Amino acid sequence: TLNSYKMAEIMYKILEKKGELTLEDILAQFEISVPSAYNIQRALKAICERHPDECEVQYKNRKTTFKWIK
């Protein structure tokens, strides 16, 4: 059992470095399953919504994409 929120915090600072994140980036970083990555993505979305001046969730028909906008 892994804390999805703690994992998402790791991704959030990777977002700041990288500028942009998708589910594939979570999968590559952690080497985990798709369902697990979606749990982290859900927690990452919650973190981004706490900082709308820094992060932008670009939900589009292709895929959810996190963008650093600070």
Curated annotation (Swiss-Prot):
Role according to the record: Essential for virus function.
Protein name: Protein F-112
Species of origin: Sulfolobus spindle-shape virus 1
Phylogenetic placement of the source organism: Viruses, Viruses incertae sedis, Fuselloviridae, Alphafusellovirus
